[PDB]
Amino acid sequence: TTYADFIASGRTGKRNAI
Amino acid sequence: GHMGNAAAAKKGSEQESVKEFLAKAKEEFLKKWESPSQNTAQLDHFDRIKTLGTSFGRVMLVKHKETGNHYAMKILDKQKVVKLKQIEHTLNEKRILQAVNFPFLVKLEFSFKDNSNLYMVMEYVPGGEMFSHLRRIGRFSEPHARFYAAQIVLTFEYLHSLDLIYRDLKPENLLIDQQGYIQVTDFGFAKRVKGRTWTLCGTPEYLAPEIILSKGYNKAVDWWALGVLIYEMAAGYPPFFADQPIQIYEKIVSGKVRFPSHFSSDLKDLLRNLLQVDLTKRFGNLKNGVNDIKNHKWFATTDWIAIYQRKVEAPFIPKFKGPGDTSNFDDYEEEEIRVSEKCGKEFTEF
Description:
The structure holds 2 protein chains of 2 kinds.
Chain A lengths: L1 H7 L10
Chain B lengths: L4 H30 L11 E8 L4 E7 L5 E8 H6 L3 H13 L8 E6 L3 E7 L6 H8 L4 H20 L2 E2 L8 E3 L5 E3 L6 E2 L16 H4 L7 H16 L9 H9 L11 H10 L16 H4 L9 H5 L42
Helix pairs in contact in B: 1-3, 5-7, 7-9
């Protein structure tokens, strides 16, 4: 599922700029 | 046609009121922009309460002594700023903040400097960022997401009329105040730019394809970013993601996006027009400007004036745990702040 892919991506936390 | 005479005249009159409002808003902005205020408080006017976050400076909860008001104070080490080569961004951020005025923009109440530091004193919103609420709830329903999106649309309409490009839209930068309304907070990447600019900046998930592709770009990158934000609010995850930024960029330029099956047709159509790689077709960048967005079917039930007036009942109020609810934030090592005069000419304008 897309949601599970989102979790597996490692980018569910706060995201830094630049 | 789609509109009979009555509805057409109503919309016509509403759009003339917007222009008249923006003309006066540009006047108020330009005067504060050409003559910025400085040194409107001093450090001894406040009681330090809690370090709430810490590079290039810290952020602590302060309490005004003569008023009792709580404020979020951005403390910036001048030497660290000079070393990180952040003089212009720091100067420009404060200059924008002291000049703008809009219901959904955080307000800079005071600013000052001493021999060691720069201080930016913002009104304190204990609600906290949209990011944490979005991750907790999972995803917002479309009426809930639409209420926030409408506030971003108006804010971008205001900012773009001032030739300001925001460039860092994301749930992390959006706070939910005690009435449940949006406060946009961080202006560190905003730039007053009439035509194009070229700086590679923003957050990977929210980067418009023309930024990734190293061409010049204009305010239309903010409307793309709105598309990302709406999608993320209504999905719970952003339209483009992967393990590493490089693979995010590949999906962004591909011109393909997929939608959850619970997205309404009206939402998908709005998002296809915002997340549009082709700048000649991106809503917000066309002849009718922002009106293609405001008149889209997904916003049919949106009363823009009532939103602007804050007369719409927010769909969500964060738990009002007092004007000093430091219990929602992580605990930081309460490092003191010393002052010994360094970097004088670099910050003359601050």
